[PDB]
Swiss-Prot record, chains A, B:
Function: Has a low paraoxonase activity. Also active, but with a lower activity, against other organo-phosphorus insecticides such as Dursban, Coumaphos, pNP-butanoate or parathion.
Name of the protein: Aryldialkylphosphatase
Domain of life: Archaea
Keyword Hydrolase attributed: yes
Alphabetized GO MF terms: aryldialkylphosphatase activity; zinc ion binding
Thermal characteristics: Thermostable.
This protein's record includes keyword Calcium: no
Modified residues annotated as N6-carboxylysine in this record: K136
């Protein structure tokens, strides 16, 4: 019941070891359209294929790629990467903005925004039959602006209609993650269908625990570390493994490796007493629940 | 010495009757990339061809199209319109933003922004040999923000290196047009190489005259009218014809006709005592000077 790029859909129970937040490529759509001389698609493709192959060599079965509007989602690029690797790849829909929406959205309703996400979930992405399996939204240093709130409310409509989960970008040093969770739950989204991202950027463990205690997954998803690993280990030590999702990604708005989790983070956890049942919770059971 | 889409360049003295600010098409790059189902390129092409043909039937020889980053500039679409009509079309470079730049520009210098404009002027647009003949920039209700100022300063660098003129979008109800003119002239741009646009939206004639008196062209370029025609006529009556540029465009950020000037504005002017020497000043001599 999870759509996959270039493949038939799969049951959530079969997702296996999952990297929940990794971008194959990211760019600003208007800059790439206007100044293509700044970009090399062939290098981007080779890098993405190599990274996915490296992840598969460490046992990754599924990658969730939350590149959406604002970060250059390209479903045809994603399909080429799948053809070259055989990875299960989950694409999403959504909008990443920090202040205002593009000019297109002037005088358009929240429902019209939600209809875009629902189109991608139910019909397909960018004129293909590859469907979106989650909604991605953001807020950062400017906080919850008028347009940021519109996108959050549209994500809630899409989740209520289609049941796909919601992944967020937040700024770990303000309350944007807590606000995203509150607005979405007030609109009727199940808290366990939300992943509040980019929380590994803060050592304020009480803030992180507050979000998890309210029922949502917490994205310790900036790996690339000790303070992050310390915070991660402390959160694990304190019993929060069933809310933790771990990734590297580095933010797609930035126009390190996808296996640094295997070379740095997981070893560090293991040598500090984290057993293999916790690793399986974080990388298999938590994504299965999120997508269930 | 003016580059033309799909043609050899022309001397500025041969530009003839010119429409200084008309968009063949406009859209938000990220929305079109992400949701192509919202758009019909074949309808857009038919509309653009018909509009250009209608303009040519009224004697227009050259159209300046200030669609740039933020409004969906597409040099290959423009070339198809030229092939279908034979119009002289001047394309530009630049960036239209009201608050912040796309994520690409985080931690990038003004010089790097200017290098993009200079690339389009000296090398070509979007991988073609069609070159940009002017720079287009904007500011609106948020005023001169940090990123808006960066783009203005980059435009000044591009003009100083290449001598192409600068067209602006401004908000007629604040001082953004006056501020654009001041910042550009402080950076060494000749005032007569600047067109401050969207001033037809205000009846504050003293503000408009202040900009013209400082040496820049004033864009009475929102046609589509009486109050605009009244303001235009009053400005003509007061001796400002040699600073007036007239167009319709309607702003490209809006994702009426290009001949409404011939069906409404020019007739109205003529029947109110405006002779044919003024019409020639506004539509032939002023563009020739601007591009000289
Ligand atoms: Co992010
Ligand atoms: Co405008
Ligand atoms: Fe990300
Ligand atoms: Fe315009």
């Amino acid at each position: 019941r999870i759509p996959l790029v270039g493949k038939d859909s799969i049951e959530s129970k079969d997702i296996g070891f999952t990297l929940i937040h990794e971008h194959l490529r990211g760019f600003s759509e208007a800059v790439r359209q206007q100044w293509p001389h700044l970009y090399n698609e062939d290098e981007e493709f080779r890098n993405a294929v190599n990274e996915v192959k490296r992840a598969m060599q460490f046992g990754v079965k599924t990658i969730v790629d939350p590149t959406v509007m604002g970060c250059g989602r390209d479903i045809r690029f994603m399909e080429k990467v799948v053809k070259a690797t055989g990875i299960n790849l989950v694409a999403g829909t959504g909008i990443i903005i920090f202040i205002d929406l593009p000019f297109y959205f002037l005088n358009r309703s929240i429902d019209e925004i939600a209809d875009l996400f629902i189109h991608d979930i139910k019909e397909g992405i960018q004129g293909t039959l590859n469907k979106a399996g989650f909604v991605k939204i953001a807020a950062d240093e400017p906080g919850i602006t008028k347009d940021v709130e519109k996108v959050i409310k549209a994500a809630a409509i899409a989740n209520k209609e289609t049941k796909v989960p919601i992944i967020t970008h937040s700024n770990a040093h303000n309350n944007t993650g807590l606000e995203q969770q509150r607005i979405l739950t007030e609109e009727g989204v199940d808290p366990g269908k939300i992943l509040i991202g980019h929380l590994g950027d803060t050592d304020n463990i009480d803030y992180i625990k507050k979000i998890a205690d309210k029922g949502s997954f917490i994205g310790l998803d900036r790996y690339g570390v000790d303070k992050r690993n310390e915070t991660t280990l402390r959160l694990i030590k304190d019993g929060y493994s069933d809310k933790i999702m771990i990734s590297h990604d580095y933010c797609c708005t930035i126009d390190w490796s996808i296996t640094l989790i295997f070379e740095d983070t997981i070893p560090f956890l293991k040598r500090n007493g984290v057993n293999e049942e916790v690793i399986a919770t974080i990388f298999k059971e938590n994504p299965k629940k999120f997508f269930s």
